[PDB]
DNA sequence: AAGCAGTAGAGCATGC
DNA sequence: CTCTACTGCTTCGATATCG
DNA sequence: AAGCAGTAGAG
DNA sequence: GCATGCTCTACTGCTTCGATATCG
């Protein structure tokens, strides 16, 4: 659905064979996994902090789960993502978390796969809330468990089946296991060629710390042709400007939010004053116009809200630099009106053939004037795995108005004589690259989270993100090997 | 529920229970904790109402306390706003005495959110806030009277805008709005009364209109306001007939033609006949020999209708009641009873009293 | 920084009597006139603007000597336009029955820049003209009307009713002339000022003579009115070395408006006596008040709150180290596609307006990016407060001037995946061959970009980039109605601004054809209700009892219908 | 100010 | 008297606040 | 925060 | 003029976004 939380279950090996790694000038698998569950609390925190995550340790001695089950430890419940159940996670960490996990937790025990994974459905039973995706890390890295037996290989093959057949999807993050990663033996079947460690862990431990929203529409509109012909859109939007999330008031000597009430009082007898004896104002020099909070948002209302079409248009018309607003994406909504994504459709291929645009006026909100707008069409781009990068419909291009734009005074036109046309065009050779999309990062946003990471876990000191906007001044300069001294002789006069 | 239970037995603990629900109510975030938190304190206002708790219920601080709200309304959502003002209402009708320097200020209050809920041409109306002041400007009407020769400024507006509220709408569900209207109408016509003998065909068009309703509660509602219309509109007649004949005999031409036909459905007939009787001091003043052909031909439609045509078996006796109260109005108007038709009407009245146990 | 403007206005015989099909001529100069003066007056400008008719039944102009120089009025002078202009352009003009001299009426006009503006010190110095073309002229005053204000720097705008070629509503780009829109006279007159006006110039006073109808929806009023925007000085620095020293200029941004509504209070109407505090309570059971200093910002990590201080804010915090418009690399076209531009604005980057080298540097530049068809990718920061941020600075090649537009580009944070389901590999989505050929139909039937009889020539009807802001005047006319009339309600819309904002009838009336196919080609069935109904509209609903065969002989005696 | 999931009770049909 | 500061002020981006 | 342009300290 | 469910409408909570007022 859309307000259904993604659930994570992470599932940790800690039973024997993670706490003698053969290097010694290496990570242990049980750090390796600790590791990664550490960055997938930290990357979910603030990248989507309404996911539910667990963290369970199955192949320990002392036990924590609701059934009483043998050797199964539940650390934390599926809830949201905080600074205590990092904190928490730290004790584990490194080559002494060994020895702080050991005095607490059990080592070595004998255990049944079909329990622990009854004790992580019953996590997924217990959440009140509505899950899109469930979900089971399996951090292991013996393959073929309960090796010396068949009644627990069977009874774990079957409870899979039980798993599965609720929704829930386990894979496995298969650790070292020397002499191979053989995952035919038991963790085929289980789950929905000898390894080594894996593809998953290593960009698993990349966090990436970036806000995602999921998709709403913004706006569902009626796209009329005169008055009759109706057709339902949704106006989606592709781009939006990250910004950074607002503070919060609090109480210096509790940390608790704090309440704020703003009221109107004149200052004549002191007594409350209601929204019902203000009004509004402008004062020009003497005049004094006087309106009211509800005839303020008289003036604004011209349209009704929608998309009034108004004919069509050559693209060629459409100047790249007539730019004002982030464009929006229409798509067509079959349930408000019946038929509506055939007419879009048919309007969408039949626009994809010459280059026309629909031009309209749009209208989002109810007192808001109408932008003139361009329903620009465009087809779908996709590949063999089915991965879509532009889908299909119109991009809704805002054009300015006639006081939106500005005017320039008046420049010389003073061209270059070819030499130089030609030697900058090598200089602009020389610094190619390929810009994709999602290259570049906000520094302010990532130092920001960062920070907020460095102060709420209060670790040592901020990390500092290393920068990306910047430019690389040797890289650039040892690019253009000496070149830029003779192109500014030949272009600059020899001085200053 | 407990306390609808048990009653005034709940007294010695009803200043706990007060500050218990003030309490819920500042510092509980849910509307759907604030909403019975002023549910408790209404019901507990209306119950310990005429009793010496009212001191210990600090009226005047509860005042401030929900007064303060609607400055800082700041997204109060809707079905919290209906109960505060229908709190505030009701602190004007139960306890008056630590509320009269600050009625004035709760009018301002009720006549600026009617204006801004009714007469926006913005947004769509909130009918909970709607309902909300209309309840609380009918408690707040109660002791603190804003009549039409006082100022009628106040009551003219209070006049348009129940007016606006009790009008018909085709598709309409969601009857609060209608009733809260209808039902300050029907407490306090008297209130607004120049404002009720201009607005005179549309006010009985609409509330005959109303009357016919498929809701028990809007019906009711309805039939209590028109016989309250009814009621201040000929005590208006009666003191001035040099100028309002021609209303009187709308009046009575109206109350005919629905006695005349037989579309009855017994409440429509109940209806004409009480207010047919009703319209008799006028008739007494204008002509003075009216009054004696009503309850001439009164009673000998009562007659007629459940006396000695003995069609008796059916819905007959169900507007019996109503038939005696117009020949009860129409006998105090009229001097020197004809002596002819007095078994009669003693004969309808203890027949009234025989079929008492069937209603 | 500052200009003048001197208006004048036609009241002759023929400006206000005809009024055959179309609105009247004079009172379209009331209309142009209050919207060129209604901005001037609700912009706050620094402006002077004199108003001076012609036709009128007085005079009193400087030289007034003979037949010359007659009916000729200066109603004021240069001077800051309050609303007694505003009410007077309304109500203190009434037309005139007298035909009066035009080319006249400049050289009355040139004689106030040099006697009102004896001291002062300006910038700009323009004369507005609305006439009719329609009264015997003198053809005196020829050379002199021309070497006179070439000699003392003077602007000049010319208006017709009519410019150089469905009911005429007030003109909706459609028919900007009629049948027969133009006397002789007329004609005579519109030969002299185009001939004067290409003589005093060349090739380009043709652009300053404007119908009524094509200035009510444009902006040409205040053409050589408006101010130059203030440059961004920087240095474009495409390595650690390399240094172009640049100024850039905000070529589009949504101008909003200026000027806030105060809030004043009922009954008192004063901004003074009202005054509002925003206090901080805690959550206990008596709301204590707490003070501006026991309170820390934080911030929400998770499912706490964690305090972060404010000294501690600006202390952790990313550090922009000032201004920068560098250079990360020259990527190609096509690979910034359109439809990730992301900020408010649009940069221009010009050189240094002085600089011989920089400007044939960033020539050379400009055209380097022309020729490869690759655009660069830059690092813009406006200053040491301002964010940094990345965009795309691509060739504007043009042969009037040449510049760099810059326009901000997301970052990863700013960008949405969103799948969607696709319609082209739909099944039951997919059109039938005849609805094809239908939305075909409609598509050819309303275009709005018709090629005229030239070579590839693609001029377009109605155009959407040229129509002022309609926000701005329904501002500036309600604001007019109740600092006139300060009691009756708000006004509705004019009729010009639906007639600006309508496509016109050419492509109305034509495509009613295919409107009326695709209606019945294409089942469309909704099921809501409810949308945009008002408390305005829910609650505004209007808008002797003793008498109660020989009767029918008492109806049939008296008066009564047909008999039997 | 609007999308979007979730629910509670208002209003009404129905009962032979 | 002929050249550099103070105020103005004008702008603009980031921030907080509200429907 | 940031900067250019009218009027006042400088021997 | 009563009793019992059933449908579905209208409201709330949460969350995003955009318009407006304000501050270094
Ligand atoms: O002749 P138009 O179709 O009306 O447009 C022209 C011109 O177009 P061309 O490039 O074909 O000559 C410029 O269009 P853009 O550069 O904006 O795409 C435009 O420039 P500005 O809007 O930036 O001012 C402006 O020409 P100019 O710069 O000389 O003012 C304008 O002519 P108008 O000003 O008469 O509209």
């Not at chain 2, 306390?3 to 010695?12: S, V």
């Not at chain 2, 408690?139 to 606006?164: A, G, H, W, Y």
């Not at chain 2, 003995?310 to 108007?333: E, H, I, K, N």
């Not at chain 3, 009519?162 to 007159?189: A, D, N, V, W």
Request: charged content about 25%; aromatic content about 10%; hydrophobic content about 40%.
């Amino acid at each position: 659905k859309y307000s259904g939380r993604d659930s994570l279950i992470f599932l940790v090996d800690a039973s024997k064979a993670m706490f003698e790694s053969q290097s010694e000038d290496e990570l242990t698998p049980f750090d390796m996994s600790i590791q990664c569950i550490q960055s997938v609390y930290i990357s979910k925190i603030i990248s989507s902090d309404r996911d539910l995550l667990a963290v369970v340790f199955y192949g320990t001695e002392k036990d924590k789960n609701s059934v009483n089950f043998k050797n199964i430890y539940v650390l934390q419940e599926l809830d949201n993502p905080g600074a205590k159940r990092i904190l928490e996670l730290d004790q584990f960490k490194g080559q002494q978390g060994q020895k702080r996990f050991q005095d607490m937790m059990g080592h070595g025990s004998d255990y049944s796969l079909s329990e622990v994974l009854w004790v992580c459905a019953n996590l997924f039973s217990d959440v009140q809330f509505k899950m899109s995706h469930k979900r089971i890390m399996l951090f292991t890295n013996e393959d073929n468990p309960h090796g010396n037996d068949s009644a627990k290989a069977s009874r774990a093959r079957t409870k899979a089946g039980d798993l599965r057949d609720t929704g829930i999807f386990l894979d496995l993050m298969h650790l070292k296991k020397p002499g191979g990663f053989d995952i035919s033996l038991f963790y085929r079947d289980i789950i929905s060629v000898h390894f080594e460690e894996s593809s998953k862990l290593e960009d698993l431990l990349r966090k990436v710390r970036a806000k995602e929203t999921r998709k709403r529409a913004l706006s569902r509109l009626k796209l009329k042709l005169n008055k009759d012909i109706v057709i339902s859109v949704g106006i989606y939007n592709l781009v939006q400007k990250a910004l950074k999330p607002p503070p919060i008031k609090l109480y210096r000597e509790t940390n608790e939010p704090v309440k704020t009430k703003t009221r109107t009082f004149n200052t004549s007898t002191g007594g409350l004053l209601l929204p019902s004896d203000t009004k509004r104002s402008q004062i020009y020099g003497s005049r004094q116009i006087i309106l009211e909070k509800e005839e303020t948002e008289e003036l604004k209302r011209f349209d009704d809200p929608g998309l009034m079409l108004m004919g069509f248009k050559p693209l060629v018309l459409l100047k790249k630099h007539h730019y004002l607003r982030p464009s929006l994406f229409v798509y067509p909504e079959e349930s408000l009106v019946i038929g509506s994504s055939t007419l879009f459709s048919a309007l969408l291929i039949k626009c994809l053939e010459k280059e026309v645009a629909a031009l309209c006026r749009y209208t989002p909100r109810r007192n808001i004037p109408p932008y003139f707008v361009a329903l620009v069409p465009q087809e779908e781009e996709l590949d063999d795995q089915k991965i879509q990068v532009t889908p299909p419909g119109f991009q809704l291009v805002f054009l300015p108005f006639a006081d939106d734009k500005r005017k320039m005074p008046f420049t010389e036109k003073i061209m270059a004589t070819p030499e130089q046309v030609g030697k900058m065009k090598a200089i602009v050779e020389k610094l190619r690259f390929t810009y994709r999309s999602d290259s570049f990062e906000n520094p302010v946003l990532q130092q920001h989270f960062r920070n907020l990471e460095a102060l709420a876990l209060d670790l040592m000191e901020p990390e500092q993100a290393v920068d990306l906007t910047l430019p690389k001044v040797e890289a650039m300069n040892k690019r253009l090997g000496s070149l830029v001294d003779e192109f500014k002789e030949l272009v600059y006069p020899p001085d200053y | 529920i407990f306390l609808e239970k048990m009653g005034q037995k709940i007294a010695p603990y009803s200043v706990e229970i007060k500050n218990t629900c003030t309490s819920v109510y500042t510092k509980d975030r849910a509307a759907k904790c604030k909403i019975p938190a002023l549910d408790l304190l209404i019901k507990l206002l209306q119950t310990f109402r005429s009793s010496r708790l009212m001191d210990e219920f600090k009226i005047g601080e509860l005042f401030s306390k929900f007064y303060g709200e609607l400055a800082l309304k700041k997204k109060i959502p809707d079905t919290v706003l209906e109960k505060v003002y229908e709190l505030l209402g009701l602190l004007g009708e139960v306890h008056p005495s630590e509320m009269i320097n600050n009625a004035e200020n709760l009018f301002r209050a009720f006549l600026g959110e009617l204006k801004t809920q009714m007469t926006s041409a913005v947004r769509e109306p909130k009918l909970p806030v709607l309902a909300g002041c209309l309840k609380g400007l009918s408690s707040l009407l109660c002791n603190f009277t804003k009549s039409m020769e006082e100022d009628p400024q106040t009551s003219r507006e209070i006049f348009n805008f129940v007016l606006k509220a009790i009008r018909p709408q085709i598709d309409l569900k969601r009857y609060a709005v209608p009733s809260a209207g209808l039902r300050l109408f029907a407490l306090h016509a008297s209130q607004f009364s120049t404002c009720l003998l201009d607005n005179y065909v549309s006010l009985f068009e609409v509330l005959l209109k109303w009357c016919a309703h498929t809701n028990v509660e809007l019906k009711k509602a309805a039939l209590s306001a028109l016989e309250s219309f009814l009621k201040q509109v000929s005590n208006m007649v009666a003191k001035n007939a040099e100028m309002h004949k021609n209303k009187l005999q709308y009046f009575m031409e109206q109350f005919y033609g629905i006695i005349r036909n037989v579309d009855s459905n017994n409440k429509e007939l109940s209806i004409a006949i009480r207010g047919y009787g009703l319209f008799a001091g006028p008739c007494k003043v204008i002509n003075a020999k009216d009054v004696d052909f009503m309850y001439v031909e009164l009673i000998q439609r009562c007659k007629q209708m459940f006396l000695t045509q003995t069609d008796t078996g059916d819905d007959r006796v169900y507007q019996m009641p109503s038939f005696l109260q117009s020949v009860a109005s129409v006998l105090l108007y009229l001097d020197t009873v004809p002596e002819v038709y007095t078994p009669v009407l003693e004969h309808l009245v203890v027949m009234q009293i025989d079929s008492f146990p069937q209603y | 920084n500052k200009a003048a403007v001197v208006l004048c206005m036609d009241v002759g015989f023929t400006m206000s009597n005809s009024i055959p099909g179309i609105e009247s001529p004079f009172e379209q100069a009331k209309k142009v006139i209050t919207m060129f003066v209604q901005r001037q007056v609700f912009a706050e400008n620094k402006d002077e603007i004199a108003l001076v008719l012609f036709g009128t039944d007085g005079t009193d102009n400087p030289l007034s000597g003979g037949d010359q120089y007659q009916n000729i009025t200066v109603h004021r002078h240069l001077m800051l336009p309050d609303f007694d202009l505003l009410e007077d352009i309304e109500s203190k003009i009434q037309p005139g029955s007298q035909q009066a001299d035009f080319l006249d009426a400049l050289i009355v006009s040139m004689d106030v820049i040099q006697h009102e503006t004896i001291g002062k010190k300006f910038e700009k110095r323009h004369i507005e003209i609305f006439t009719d073309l329609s009264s015997r002229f003198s053809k005196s005053q020829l050379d002199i009307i021309i070497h006179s204000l070439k000699k003392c720097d003077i602007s000049l705008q010319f208006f017709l009713p009519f410019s150089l070629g469905g009911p005429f509503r007030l003109g909706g780009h459609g028919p900007s002339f009629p049948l027969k829109g133009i006397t002789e006279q007329q004609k005579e007159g519109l030969e002299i000022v185009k001939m004067v006006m290409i003589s005093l110039e060349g090739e380009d006073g043709l652009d300053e003579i404007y119908s009524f109808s094509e200035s009510l929806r444009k902006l040409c009023v205040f053409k050589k009115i408006e101010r130059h925007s203030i440059h961004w000085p920087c240095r474009l620095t495409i390595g650690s070395n390399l240094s172009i020293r640049i100024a850039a200029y905000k070529s589009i941004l949504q101008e909003r408006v200026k000027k806030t509504w105060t809030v004043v209070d009922a009954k008192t109407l004063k901004k003074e006596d009202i005054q509002k505090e925003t206090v901080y309570c805690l959550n206990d059971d008596d709301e204590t008040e707490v003070l501006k200093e026991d309170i820390i910002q934080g911030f929400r990590y998770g499912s706490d709150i964690v305090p972060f201080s404010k000294v501690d804010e600006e202390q952790m915090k990313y550090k922009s180290e000032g201004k920068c418009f560098s250079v990360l690399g020259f990527c190609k076209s096509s690979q910034v596609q359109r439809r990730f531009f992301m900020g408010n604005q649009v940069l221009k980057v010009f050189a240094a307006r002085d600089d011989e080298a920089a400007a044939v540097a960033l020539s050379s530049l400009i055209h380097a990016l022309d020729d490869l068809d690759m655009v660069a990718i830059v690092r813009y920061a406006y200053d040491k407060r301002a964010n940094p941020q990345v965009g795309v600075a691509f060739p504007h090649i043009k042969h009037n001037y040449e510049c760099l537009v810059y326009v901000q580009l997301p970052f990863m944070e700013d960008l949405r995946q969103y799948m969607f389901s696709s319609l082209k590999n739909s099944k039951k989505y997919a059109p039938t061959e005849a609805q094809l050929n239908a939305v075909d139909a409609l598509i050819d039937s309303m275009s709005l970009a018709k090629k005229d009889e030239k070579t590839d020539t693609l001029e377009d009807l109605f155009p959407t980039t040229k129509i002022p802001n309609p926000r701005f005047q329904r501002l500036f006319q309600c604001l007019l109605h109740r600092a006139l009339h300060p009691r009756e309600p708000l006004p509705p819309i004019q009729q010009h601004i639906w007639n600006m904002l309508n496509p016109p009838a050419e492509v109305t009336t034509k495509s009613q054809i295919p409107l009326s196919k695709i209606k019945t080609l294409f089942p469309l069935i909704e099921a809501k209700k409810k949308d945009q109904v008002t408390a305005q509209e829910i609650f505004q609903d209007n808008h002797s009892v003793s008498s109660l065969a020989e009767n029918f002989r008492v109806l049939v005696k008296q008066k009564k219908a047909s008999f039997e």
